[PDB]
Amino acid sequence: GADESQVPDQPSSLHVRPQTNCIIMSWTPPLNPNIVVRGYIIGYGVGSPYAETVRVDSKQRYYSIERLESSSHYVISLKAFNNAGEGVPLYESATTRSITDVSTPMLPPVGVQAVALTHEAVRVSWADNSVRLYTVRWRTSSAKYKSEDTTSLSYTATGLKPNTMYEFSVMVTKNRRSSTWSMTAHATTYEA
């Protein structure tokens, strides 16, 4: 950076990913490299970004705003600064999630069935009482697992050594939040 004569111009981007009690924020430096950037002033708060102010390193691209309230609309502001002073801010706003989401921790899927289709294939299906990323895993029934993700309530496993009993499990993910491994179903592939 050539010279500190004037304050930094505004940051180029700002993006915010709200958690339930937290908020994650990312950004990028101004497009003009020639003006020395000595760090950033983040500021934040409910309805206005004045409740709190954090100061950071010039090389910081990331920050986590870490003690916050459920279901609250926070406004965030970001400034770059140097010896001249602080430049014009960039803003964004985010509404934290509800404690409802962490109240009941996610529970696996139920009513799981694995029926052998062929020598190389087994159909897996499950149910859900919630009315969504499901993760299926399989292994031999020592030898270890194989993973796959689906957007639907049924998957079809391929590439299986024939006449071998496998073990299938499913989990689920909601709003980036995951349950544990659902109960296992045992199916033996067909003789080829």
Partner 1 sequence: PDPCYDEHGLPRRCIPDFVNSAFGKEVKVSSTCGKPPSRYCVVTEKGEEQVRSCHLCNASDPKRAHPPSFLTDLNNPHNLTCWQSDSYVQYPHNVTLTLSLGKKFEVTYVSLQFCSPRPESMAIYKSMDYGKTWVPFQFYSTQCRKMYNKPSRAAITKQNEQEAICTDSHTDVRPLSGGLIAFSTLDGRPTAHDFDNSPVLQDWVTATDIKVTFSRLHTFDDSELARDSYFYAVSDLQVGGRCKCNGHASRCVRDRDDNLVCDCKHNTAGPECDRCKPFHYDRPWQRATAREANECVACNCNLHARRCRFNMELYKLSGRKSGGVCLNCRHNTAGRHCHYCKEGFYRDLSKPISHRKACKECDCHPVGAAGQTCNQTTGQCPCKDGVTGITCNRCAKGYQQSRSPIAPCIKI
Interaction site with partner 1 (CB under 8 A): 7, 46-50, 71, 73, 75, 84-89, 91-93, 107-108, 110-113, 127, 129, 169, 180-186
Cβ 65 to partner 1 shortest distance, Å: 16
Residue 120 or 153 having the CB closest to partner 1: 153
Cβ 76 to partner 1 shortest distance, Å: 9
Cβ 110 to partner 1 shortest distance, Å: 5
* Distances from the Cα of 183 to the Cα of 34, 36, 159, angstroms: 59, 58, 23
| CA 168/CA 35 separation, integer angstroms | 58
Residue 28 or 113 having the CB closest to partner 1: 113
Residue 107 or 120 having the CB closest to partner 1: 107
| CA 101/CA 95 separation, integer angstroms | 14
Please return the burial class of 189, using the count of CB atoms within 10 Å of its CB with bins 0-12, 13-18 and 19+: buried
| CA 22/CA 32 separation, integer angstroms | 32
